């Protein structure tokens, strides 16, 4: 005979443990990463001496 | 099923907590004493078997926390 | 902020591996497991001789 | 969660097969040669440590096996 085996939603859960969550809900909004900046300054005033 | 391989040390880290939120550990941990805790005459078996093989005492202690753990 | 962790019937159905089933709808239907008679057998014929 | 203690060795067996059929043990070993076959480094690292500490032959290959069933 057969058998369903259920949902595995808890399972799913279970295993995506140790990993990052996300917000998906308008077309994505990602989070938690890092990024690499190179920073030039010169092009800088001190808001007037 | 997906009960296991649960996506531990594949890297992909950041700053922030990501699933679990450091329960996963104390899940895993707290489980397996619960499992030593209610069968004490598997843990003594294992205990003889570290006396047995290995003699040398950090071999012993090695395979004995090794057996406790090989509980699936 | 909360999360519900889902339905863990798939994992309650892979804790439960190992353990015999059984179908309960109408009161009990129990079945596989064993039992213990002794037989005594006199008050027998042959179905007539 | 119940993703483990899979209820394995508690006794209470009978003639008839119970729930998965023969089909919980298959699992189990195909999930550790994937996961052994996936991360060949921690399988070498492994076979180092089997190497450096026991260094009698049949220590090794115990907690040689054991490391490679020490994954949760």
């Known amino acids: 005979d057969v058998v369903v085996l ?12 140790g990993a990052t969550e996300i917000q998906m809900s308008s077309g994505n909004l990602l989070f938690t990463g890092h990024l690499k900046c190179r920073l030039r300054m010169d092009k800088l005033q001190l808001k007037g001496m | 099923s997906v009960a296991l391989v649960p996506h531990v040390g594949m890297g992909l880290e950041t700053r922030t907590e990501t699933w679990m939120s450091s329960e996963g550990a104390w899940k895993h941990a707290q489980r397996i004493e619960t499992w030593i805790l209610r069968h004490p005459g598997f843990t003594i078996m294992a205990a003889i078997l570290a006396y047995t093989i290995g003699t040398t005492y950090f071999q012993r202690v090695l395979i004995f926390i090794l057996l406790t753990a090989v509980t699936p």
Chains 1, 3 share one sequence.
């Open chain 1, 6 to 17: 259920g949902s595995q939603e808890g399972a799913m859960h279970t295993a995506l443990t």
